[PDB]
Amino acid sequence: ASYKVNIPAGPLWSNAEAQQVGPKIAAAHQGNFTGQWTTVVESAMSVVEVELQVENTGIHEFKTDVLAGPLWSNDEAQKLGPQIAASYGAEFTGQWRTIVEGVMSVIQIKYTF
Amino acid sequence: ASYKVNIPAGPLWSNAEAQQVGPKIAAAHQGNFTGQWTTVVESAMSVVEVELQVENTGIHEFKTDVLAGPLWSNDEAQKLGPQIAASYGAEFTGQWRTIVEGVMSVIQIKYTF
């Protein structure tokens, strides 16, 4: 199954640029650009409508760390990791670390494509 | 300046769960959960509305690689990199590399917080 969300694209100056760039942003998020887009902050930010899969499948994988917000402990990270990872369209591997005490932590996620 | 987008959260089974999870996903994406949410695929996927800032500033940073879709040349990476980075709420450092020939590349982004 799939669904749609708007994803930031930075400023998009024309429909011509949007139709060229939208598919690139979508591909980076394992989705497909629908053709619809909106400037949300004049000369500063636009978003593109991207169709995403509830579950990404494929035979390749890539692992990396992304922001997780500040996490209190490993036990909380194990509890919240899966959902935070799902917000990136990926899975949580269980690995994580705080990078700035009281401010920010990161989790390792796994992309399948 | 700010703007709002819906971010995947996986299935959310009650408003209570959404209010507990929404802030965590928002914090992982450097935004503020608005309290609003929607299920987009019954029993499989819900999204939480998050207010993002056009520009994320701060004295701390974290660099990492993220999916960039397939990139065919340094020229395309230079052109698309900042835009793809913006789609992650971050900045493009200029570094990138293909991870699966003809299928996928990644770019290095810098989160500032």
Swiss-Prot record, chains A, B:
GO cellular component, one term: cytoplasm
Keyword field contains Signal: no
Keywords attached to this entry: Antiviral protein, Cytoplasm, Glycosidase, Hemagglutinin, Hydrolase, Lectin, Repeat
InterPro entries: MVL, OligoMan_bind_ChitinaseAct_sf
Localization (cell): Cytoplasm
EC number: 3.2.1.-
Region (Linker): 55-59
GO function terms (MF aspect): carbohydrate binding; hydrolase activity, acting on glycosyl bonds
Temperature characteristics of this protein: Half the hemagglutinating activity is maintained by heating at 50 degrees Celsius for 3 hours. Is inactive by heating at 60 degrees Celsius for 10 minutes.
Sequence repeats: 1-54, 60-113
Tree of life domain: Bacteria
Residues involved in a carbohydrate 2 binding: 70-74, 78, 94-102
Residues engaged in binding a carbohydrate 1: 11-15, 19, 35-43
Free-text function comment from the UniProt entry: Carbohydrate-binding protein that binds oligomannosides such as Man(6)GlcNAc(2) with sub-micromolar affinities. The specificity of MVL is unique in that its minimal target comprises the Man-alpha-(1->6)-Man-beta-(1->4)-GlcNAc-beta-(1->4)-GlcNAc tetrasaccharide core (Man(2)A) found in N-linked oligomannosides. Displays hemagglutininating activity on rabbit, horse and hen erythrocytes. This activity is inhibited by yeast mannan. Does not bind mono- and disaccharides. Unexpectedly for a lectin, one of the 2 oligomannose binding sites of MVL can catalyze the cleavage of chitin fragments (such as chitotriose, i.e. GlcNAc(3) or GlcNAc-beta-(1->4)-GlcNAcbeta-(1->4)-GlcNAc, and chitotetraose, i.e. GlcNAc(4)) to GlcNAc. This weak beta-1,4-glycosidase activity is restricted to the C-terminal carbohydrate-binding site. Does not cleave Man(3)GlcNAc(2) or the tetrasaccharide Man(2)A.
The record's note on its domains: Each monomer contains 2 structurally homologous domains with high sequence similarity connected by a short five-amino acid residue linker. Intriguingly, a water-filled channel is observed between the 2 monomers.
Protein name: Lectin MVL
Gene designation per UniProt: mvl
